[PDB]
């Protein structure tokens, strides 16, 4: 992974500078001299640094796929997909096409999308034969009652708006319904333990404490 960060002050900042980037939420991480940009780094960075694995905060593109009780699901599975998406990670997910007839040419394709979505198909076709990353989903000569399986990634390009759009197999009525959602939060540590956290006069954001009015120092100990 690589991550290139420009004097980010959080967290979310931090993790929409790209899909590499991840985010040590360690109390007092940074040194005199640092400003809170050395937060964000690539993990192994971080860890290098004495971050632990679970104050790195790093959330991560995911697929989560249902079928129907499948007295209803014909010829493509699964029917519904849910994708978290990280900007600039591929969430991948497999769908099946099975036919119970003689199926000759098969192209797997989604309804028009917004710019910032993009979409590519793997198709693993009978014999063997392999496609990689193309526009579209392509097989050709599927025998009877042999699932065909086509790998799809859905990669946004920044913290998207919910939306849906569809899967199709042309010339099929069958339909992949696909959710996708943004994935750009820190879930970090909050203070709600803690009365001492930020000497109890600050918050306490992904590892930064933000003083009250009439506070200062990086724990919020002076007062002026
Ligand atoms: C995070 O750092 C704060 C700040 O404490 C300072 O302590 C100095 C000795 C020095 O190391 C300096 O670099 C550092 O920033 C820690 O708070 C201190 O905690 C002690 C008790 O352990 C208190 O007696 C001090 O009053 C208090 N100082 C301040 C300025 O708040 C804090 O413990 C630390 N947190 C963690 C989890 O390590
Ligand atoms: C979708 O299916 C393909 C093919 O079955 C999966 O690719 C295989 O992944 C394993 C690792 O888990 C490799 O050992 C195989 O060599 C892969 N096969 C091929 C043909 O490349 C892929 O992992 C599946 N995708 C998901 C998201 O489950």
Redesign the pocket.
């Known amino acids: 992974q690589e991550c290139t960060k420009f004097k980010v002050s959080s967290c979310r900042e931090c993790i929409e500078s790209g899909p590499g980037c991840t985010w040590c939420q360690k109390?007092?991480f940074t040194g005199p001299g640092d400003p809170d940009s050395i937060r964000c780094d690539t993990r192994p960075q971080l860890l290098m640094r004495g971050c632990a694995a679970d104050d790195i905060m790093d959330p991560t593109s995911l697929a989560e796929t249902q079928e129907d009780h499948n007295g209803g699901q014909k010829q493509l599975s699964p029917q519904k997909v849910t994708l978290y998406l990280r900007p600039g990670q591929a969430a991948a997910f497999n769908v099946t096409f099975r036919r119970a007839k003689g199926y000759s040419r098969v192209f797997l394709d989604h309804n028009a999308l917004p710019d910032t979505l993009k979409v590519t198909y793997d198709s693993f076709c009978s014999n063997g034969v392999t496609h990689r990353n193309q526009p579209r989903g392509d097989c050709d000569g599927v025998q009877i009652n042999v699932p065909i399986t086509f790998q799809v990634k859905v990669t946004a390009t920044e913290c998207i708006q919910e939306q849906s759009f569809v899967i199709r197999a042309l010339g099929f009525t069958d339909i992949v319904t696909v959710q996708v959602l943004p994935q750009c939060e820190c879930r970090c540590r909050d203070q709600s333990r803690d009365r001492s956290l930020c000497?109890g006069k600050g918050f306490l954001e992904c590892g930064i404490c933000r003083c009250d009015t009439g506070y200062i120092?990086?724990?919020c100990?002076h007062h002026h």
């Open positions: 109390l007092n000497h120092g990086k724990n100990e």
